Structure formats: structure tokens, C-alpha cells
Amino acid sequence: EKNVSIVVAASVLSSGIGINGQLPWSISEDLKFFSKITNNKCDSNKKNALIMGRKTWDSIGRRPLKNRIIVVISSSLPQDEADPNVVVFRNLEDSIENLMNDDSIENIFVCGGESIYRDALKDNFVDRIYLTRVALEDIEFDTYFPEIPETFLPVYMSQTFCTKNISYDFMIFEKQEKQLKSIDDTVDLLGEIAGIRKMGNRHKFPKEEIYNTPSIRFGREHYEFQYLDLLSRVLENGAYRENRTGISTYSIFGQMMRFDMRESFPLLTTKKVAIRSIFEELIWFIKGDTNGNHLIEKKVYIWSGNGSKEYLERIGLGHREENDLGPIYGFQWRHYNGEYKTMHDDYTGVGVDQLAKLIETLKNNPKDRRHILTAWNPSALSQMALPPCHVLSQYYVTNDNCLSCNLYQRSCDLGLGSPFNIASYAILTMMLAQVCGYEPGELAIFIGDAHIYENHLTQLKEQLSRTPRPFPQLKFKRKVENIEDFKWEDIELIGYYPYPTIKMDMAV
Amino acid sequence: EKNVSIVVAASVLSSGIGINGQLPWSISEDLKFFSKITNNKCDSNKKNALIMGRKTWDSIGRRPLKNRIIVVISSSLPQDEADPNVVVFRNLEDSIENLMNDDSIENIFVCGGESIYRDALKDNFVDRIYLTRVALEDIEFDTYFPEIPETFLPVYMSQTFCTKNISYDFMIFEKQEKRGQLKSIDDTVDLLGEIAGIRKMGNRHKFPKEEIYNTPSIRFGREHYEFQYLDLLSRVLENGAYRENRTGISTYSIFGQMMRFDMRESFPLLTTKKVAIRSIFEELIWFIKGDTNGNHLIEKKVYIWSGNGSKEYLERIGLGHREENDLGPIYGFQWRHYNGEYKTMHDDYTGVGVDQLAKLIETLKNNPKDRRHILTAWNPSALSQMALPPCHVLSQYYVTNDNCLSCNLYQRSCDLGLGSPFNIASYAILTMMLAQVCGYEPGELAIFIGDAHIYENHLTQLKEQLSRTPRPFPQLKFKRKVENIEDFKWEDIELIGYYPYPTIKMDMAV
């Protein structure tokens, strides 16, 4: 008995691990990771053994690895003797015996060639798989990682990283075989006694059947889990409620989500997200625009319904022309407190420009604590087609000169709105970072009424059955001078490989 | 081997457990807890044994406990085979002996009397201690739970509960003599951290080192909500970035963090330092009445808004033309007269500006499930006239299906050392007030911080605080049902069972 682990790097969609006797890419961090995992051991007078196939041997210059013993599988290679850090076997099965003996061998790693992976998995020799998911998928491959067998379950998944615009995961799987007992025994007995009265009961852990990729118990580091686990928590504990819209929701109050923005862009991968619409709705905010026709003109219908004659009629704004949403987001951002008459009037100079003051303060007085944008105007709400959901947002220049964002959101709808805000404020923050001279840092979203519309239950349950994939990267093709000059065309999505788009109808 | 646990309920400060042959209180959740912990077992063919002194056995009426075996330590009581569910032993040590005897015995509980506890601990018989800390002192006790020996560390502390206004609290201590979920995941996350450094968000949120983490041996059971404040503290202490600011005094800062606090079973007043509760109530209702006159506070001997309401400060910021302690359209002006025109702190502003606190109340009452119960103080039009731009910037309220009122607050900037304890207490109280007035019960308070920072002239004070294990939170009850939210008065408030550590002096950053 001694541990056997595969170590592989494979393309996210098709497990492409090689082309023309070489890799499909060069990613140093991955070689570094390979170096750390294969070198790692306790008793420092033993060596780990790296098993590989002759073509892979061939592939790295037949040049030995520091501090490790290579084991080449070949029919032809002479079992040499020049070198003791490189040994040769005629088949994979006998190459083990590694186990039995060489007590000078702590761990065994299967380092691949397809033919070798395929044999290790078929003859059931491997216990763990360390898999580096690489997000590049329209390139030639002639070598694949075989399908992970059912006996294996994912138990870790890291955040997404970036190298020269390529996103990658790493990820661990364990061959399955079948804190205190006291602390949990206590917490449960107090839970039985107290019922609703113990706050832990009001915040129950989600059940396996509604928790995305359940085997991943202690390694939920991919920040997309921050979104999916939120979904589970409400699936789990949400109270059923009626609301102004016909359609009722499951709801809980006071939640939060966090996303890295240094290494990747947080566009959900568990459903294809309408990034264009998101972007297009953002510059419309930025420009201070409240004319819904401008979005519709670019073929973005997200605000259609809240600007229809009937909807505005139903809510007291029947005096408005179709699509005059009144002083909603964009207007409070550039014209805070301005007096709104119609989308046709000229507002240049009226009201506080928050957004301009934001940029000025952000470049001139970075460490100061007042970088705030707010849409919550008690005096305007009744003229808005909808009061805002994303209500207030605070911005933060780190000592190392990234820009982070906090968004307070009164009423994210988890199914539709939420994945939008995530992307939206990510971008707003990247935009502010170009314009002000910083790099993107972190995004934290604080939620008030976090809920799911009931007509989304099955759809979101579908989403919850899909294991997340590395986030993509998002780059600007040019440096702008004023932030209102950004255009869709400027924007580059690198490496977005989502699952099918999931249809969800918006409750009006 | 075979577990021996002490189970005891004791007063938080002096460890009182008994007076005149009885308990100094009557708290049935505790008897429920006792019963659960002592009945709990795997093998339906074995039983647990509870050990007690004769006088304790007298205490419970000499009747057996369902489903368990009582073992009475007495010199004199007869060893009579009548009850198979009660056996007498002449000494604790022999009774311990349950350990090899009675394969039929699964677990062992020392159920007390001071003399059985003292003996069990002195003779080192015992592995774990289940302790219910009862928050009333200043009453008569004649029996005590011994001081817990240094060989035990605490490993769990529950949230605070309430019964007939008495706060209480469950903890476990383990005899500890001679990350980790398994190796493979911590190793991999460690290796990744090394490859990536600052590039892996995990390295940006490093775990607090043991010497700065409050009560470190409690690692998987930091349930007491006091820990939400303390752990935040240790977190900026471990990752907080240095930065100079508008005050000569620099801060250590991180960005984006949160705290939850229950308000159904207790009042979230920090116990690890005596907190100026009066001054908090007096500012709070100052805000509710919509008042901006700094004098009204000083007149009630509350000096928190003095430094910011003085002649020099008002000068240095461009408000020289303002009467002393005219603070401007700060918090309560915006709550009552959002966007109204600020003349002076003397004008009458009846009917001016949007009255948010009124709309709030109307909305909680008539539209409980609506998502627009919102209180805001961030008014870009009015920042400059303000002695100080607001820190508790926005709050939301939420009526649960079982009629409790919850509050979320977004705080852009938060002095962990000084303002934060005020904010927790402040908004717990406001929420309790809003709840009474609207017909509901207190629910939960969540607090979202933008800039969470510790002032550098505070480090040693907060380090001191971090070395004190928290005690169960007190209760706060209103003595009468007010008709209007601005009628509340300090006199109307009762603070039951607040037992803090001594106050810790910290200088304000002007």
C-alpha cells in the first residue's frame, strides 16, 4: 500500500492533452504545479516515482527530473544502468512493485501519455487524479485524457487563474470506496430543543440534492460557487412569499457573494450569459440615459416591459411616453437630485455628477473613504419605472493599486438579475480601473432580499446539476479617454465555454 | 475506553450552581439539554450512567431518570437491589469502574454536587465538560462548580439563549494534553498559494494567526455571535493594509466583510468590553427625533459628537459660519427631512424634506413583504454642509414569515475599535423599536462593511480585548409599549444580565 495519483492537464471541453508529440500550449504555472505536487512528500529520504510512457519520456528531452525517480514504460527502451533516477519496465502492471519494496519510494504518480493513463484507470491502479483544466478548445488535438470513471468524485476545484489570457483550473478527484462528533452532536441537540429559536436552524445547510457538485465538500474555491451556493441556500431555507408581481418567490435576507477579478472575469459558466446586453445596459447607465428606446435600438430588450404603455399605465406613470423610465439608474448616477421632466429634456449641468466625482476622487484621493455611487433617491422613487435594485456601491484602491468594488443590492432576483449584476459591476470596475490607472481587484456583493421566482425552480435546478468550468478572461482592446467612450467592439471575451443557455421568463 | 463527561449549569461570573439544596434558577431548556446529552448513545442495548452525590439525588426527589442508570455516591445509603436503575457506591473512584464493569454502560456523566465535581477533577477522572453558563449573578449561592483546570480548553460556545429574561449559553471543554480536512486539499491549496502568492485570492484573505485569534482552541464551534465582531477584528489585524488618512492617525484596512447577530434570543452588546450603552441610546433617538443640535447630547452628558461639533473643526472644514455644535444635515436630518433645505439647527423643519422614518413604518405595517423598506443617509447634495459624511449609509428591513423584523446595514467606513460596537448596539435597538411600533418581533441583524479598519493607536487596546473569552449576551427589554417611535426614553429600557469585562479606553480620531 502506497498512494497512486494521476497528474494531467486537459482542455476543458474535450480533454485534449497533446498534439504532434507535444503539448497544445505552454503554461509555466502548470509546470510549477506539476513540480510541487510530484515533489511533495513527508519523509525527505524517500523519492516519489513518476511513471510515464516512452513517447512522453521522448517528449521532455529524455532529461531526468530533479529529486524524483522516473519510470519509463517501453517495449524497446533498454533497461539501462547509466542513470538510477530513470528506470524502465515492459508494462505498467509490473512497474508496480514500486509499492511492494522501494520503501525508498513514498509516492507514485502516473504522469501520462494517453496510453498510460488509459491503462492505469482500466486496471484500477489510481486513487487520486490531479487535473489541470485548460480553457482552450478550438485547436487540433491528437491525444486525450480518458473519461474519468464513475468511481471517482471531485473533492476540490480552485479559483480560475490566467496566463497570457488563457484561463485554467486545477481540480482533485478521489476514488470513492464507500470536526467533533461531540460538537455536532451538541449543536444538533440544541437544534432539537430550540427549533426556530436557534439561528443555525434558520440557516440550514443545503441538502445534497440541491447543492452543486456535492462531493466537493472542502474545496469550493471556484468563485462561481459563491453564486451557486447562494442559490442552494435559498432553495433550502427560503420562505415562500407573494410580491407585487403576480409570481411568488422563495426568499431569505442578508447574503453575500465574492468574486476575484484579478485572474479572470466572473461571467457564470453554468449557463450562457447575455454579456452583450449586460454591457449595453451598462454604458447606457454610464451615459446617464433613461430612454429605453436607446436599448431597444441596439436590440437589447431587458427594459422593454418596464417601459411598456400598459406597465407604466398600471403603476401611475401613464403620462409617460413609452420607454421613458424616468430618473432611474443612469440619471441618478450623472444627475443626482436633478428635477426630472421627460427623457427629451436636456440635463447637461443639472444635479450632482456622482460618476464624475467618483473618477476624480478615485485618481486624486485614492485611500480616502468616500468613493460611493448611490441610486437610492427618496425624492425620485415614485417617478422611476422601478426603484433601483443595485442601490449603493463603494470603491477601494488597494495599497498595490488594484480597484475593488462592493455592491449593496436590495433585491437581486437570483435567477436573472443576479448573474447580470455580477458581470455588470465587474465591468464597471474594470472600466473605472482603466480610466483611473489601476488594475481590477475584488467584487463583493451584499444582498438584501435574495430570492428565486417560482417559475424558475426547475430551470435553476438544471443549472445546479452542471459542474462549473473555469471563468473566462475579459480584456479591453483599447485605452479610452472618457469612460463613456467604451463600445461593445472594444471588448474581448477570451475562453468562455459555458453550458447551454437556460431560458427564464422575467416577472413584470 | 469509555467517555466520562461532567455536565453542569453555572453562573457565568462566580460559578454558582446551587443554593440551599436547590438550583438558584429554573430554566427548562437546560433540563432539556441535560436530558438530551445524557440520553444520547449509539448502542440501543447499552445505557448511560449518571453519577451524583447523595444530596443531588435528594434534590431530584430520589426518582430514577428514564432510560439511564443513576449512580449515587454516599457513605450511608443502602446498597439495596430494589432499583436496578439506581446503584450506590461508597466512593467516586470505585464507581468509576463503570469503565470496565457494565459492558452495558456506553457513556459516563458526572452530574454533580460540588463535592463530586471537585473529586472527579482533582483525581483527573474526566475528559469533557458540558457547561451551561447562566447569566444572573448578585444572588445567593452556597455551591460552586470548581475552577476549570488548565488541562481543559474550550472547543465550542453556542449562541446565547433566553428564558424568562435570563441569558444563557452552552459550551464544551475537552481535556487536551499530548485545514486538515485531509492533507491532499490543504497541500494542494498550499502549493497553489506558493506558486501564485498574491495572485490567488486565498492569499489575500489569510487566516488569523493563533496569537491574534480570540479563544483559539474553539476552532469548529464559534457559534456565539460575539465572534462575528472578534474574528473580523483579528482579520484586519492579520491582513489589514497600512494607510494614512484625514486624521494624522493611520489605519490598517481591508475591504468587504460582514457580521451577523441574532436578536431573537439576546441583545448583541459586546461582552468583551463594557460598552457605553446609554450614549448609544441617546444618539440613536436623537437621530429618530431628527435632531442635528450637538447640544442636546452634551446636555445629557453624551460627548461623542463633541469633537466634530466644535469651533476649530467646523472652521478647518469650511463651516466657520456655523453656530457651535450645529452639526449640519447629518444622520437624522436625512432620516426625517431627506433633501430638505438646511437653514440652521434652530429652524423648525416640520413638513420639509422626505420623512423616511415615517414611510418606513407605514411600509413595514402595510406592505410587510414588499422589498422597499429602505433607510438612507447618503445624500450627495448635502455632504459638504455636513459636519461629517455618514458612515452608516444605508439600511434595509425585512419582515419574516413568522413576524420578525430583520435589519441589514451597509457601513462604508467603520471604526472597528470604536464605532462598530456602537453600530451593532445602535441598530439592534432601532430594529427593536421599529419592531414594537410595527407589531413584530426582533429577527436578525446583518452588517456589511466597506472599509473595515483599525486605528493604529488602538492596536494594544484591541489586542487586550482579543484575549478575553466572551460571555453570553445580555437581554434588553422595553418597559412599556410607546405610541410613537420618538417617545422612547432611556428610562423605558431594561438591560438584564449584562456582565462585561472592564471598559477599555480608546481615543477618538477627530
Ligand SMILES: NC(=O)C1=CN([C@@H]2O[C@H](COP(=O)(O)OP(=O)(O)OC[C@H]3O[C@@H](n4cnc5c(N)ncnc54)[C@H](OP(=O)(O)O)[C@@H]3O)[C@@H](O)[C@H]2O)C=CC1
Ligand atoms: N497534457 C498533459 O498533461 C500530458 C500530455 N502528454 C502528451 O501525450 C502525448 C504522448 O502520449 P501517448 O501518445 O499516449 O504516448 P505515451 O506517453 O503514452 O507513450 C507511449 C509508449 O509507451 C509505451 N507503452 C504504452 N503502453 C505499453 C504497454 N502496454 N506495454 C509496453 N509498453 C507500453 C510504448 O513505448 P514503446 O514504443 O517504446 O514500446 C508506447 O509507444 C504527447 O503529445 C504528450 O505531449 C503527455 C503527458 C502529459
Ligand SMILES: NC(=O)C1=CN([C@@H]2O[C@H](COP(=O)(O)OP(=O)(O)OC[C@H]3O[C@@H](n4cnc5c(N)ncnc54)[C@H](OP(=O)(O)O)[C@@H]3O)[C@@H](O)[C@H]2O)C=CC1
Ligand atoms: N447547577 C447544577 O448544574 C447542579 C447543581 N447542584 C446543586 O448542588 C447542591 C448539591 O451539591 P453538594 O452540596 O456538593 O452535594 P453532593 O450532590 O455533592 O452530595 C454530597 C454527598 O455525596 C456523598 N459523598 C460525597 N463525597 C463522598 C465521599 N468521598 N465518600 C462517600 N460519600 C461521598 C455524601 O453523601 P452522604 O452524606 O450520604 O455520605 C455527601 O454528603 C444542591 O444545591 C444541588 O441542587 C447539583 C447538581 C447540578
Ligand SMILES: C#CCN(Cc1ccc2[nH]c(N)nc(=O)c2c1)c1ccc(C(=O)N[C@H](CCC(=O)O)C(=O)O)cc1
Ligand atoms: C440584473 C439586471 C438588469 N435587468 C433589469 C431588471 C428590471 C426589472 C426586473 N424585474 C424583476 N421582477 N426582476 C428582474 O430581474 C428585473 C431586472 C434585467 C432584466 C431582464 C433580464 C433578462 O431577461 N435577461 C435575459 C434575457 C434577455 C437577454 O438574453 O439579453 C435572461 O433571460 O437571462 C436581465 C436583467
Ligand SMILES: C#CCN(Cc1ccc2[nH]c(N)nc(=O)c2c1)c1ccc(C(=O)N[C@H](CCC(=O)O)C(=O)O)cc1
Ligand atoms: C458610531 C458613532 C457615533 N460617533 C461619532 C463619530 C465621529 C467621528 C469619528 N471619527 C472616527 N475616526 N471614528 C469614529 O468612530 C467616529 C465617530 C462616535 C464617536 C466616538 C465614540 C466613542 O468614543 N465611544 C465610547 C467612549 C465614549 C462613551 O463612553 O460614551 C467608546 O470608547 O466606546 C463613539 C461613537
Ligand SMILES: CN(Cc1cnc2nc(N)nc(N)c2n1)c1ccc(C(=O)N[C@@H](CCC(=O)O)C(=O)O)cc1
Ligand atoms: C511529462 N510532462 C508532460 C506534462 C506536461 N504538463 C503536465 N501538466 C500536468 N498537470 N500534468 C502532467 N502530467 C503534465 N505532463 C512533463 C513533465 C515534467 C516537466 C517539467 O519541466 N517539469 C519540471 C518543472 C519545471 C518548472 O518548474 O517549470 C519539474 O521540475 O518537475 C515538463 C513536462
Ligand SMILES: CN(Cc1cnc2nc(N)nc(N)c2n1)c1ccc(C(=O)N[C@@H](CCC(=O)O)C(=O)O)cc1
Ligand atoms: C441533577 N439535577 C440538578 C441539575 C439541574 N440542572 C443541570 N443542568 C446541567 N446542565 N447539568 C446538570 N448536572 C444539572 N443538574 C437534575 C437532574 C435531572 C433533572 C431532571 O428532571 N431531568 C429530567 C429532565 C427532563 C426534562 O425536563 O426534559 C431528565 O429527563 O433528564 C433535574 C435536575
Ligand SMILES: O=c1ccn([C@H]2C[C@H](O)[C@@H](COP(=O)(O)O)O2)c(=O)[nH]1
Ligand atoms: O440589477 C438588478 C435590476 C433589478 N432586479 C430585480 C429584483 C426584483 O425582482 C425586481 C424589483 O422588485 P421590487 O423591489 O420592485 O418588488 O427587480 C435585480 O435583481 N437586479
Ligand SMILES: O=c1ccn([C@H]2C[C@H](O)[C@@H](COP(=O)(O)O)O2)c(=O)[nH]1
Ligand atoms: O455612525 C458612525 C459615525 C461615524 N463613524 C466613523 C467611521 C470613520 O472612522 C469616521 C469617518 O472617517 P472618514 O470617512 O472621514 O475618513 O467616522 C462610524 O464608524 N459610525
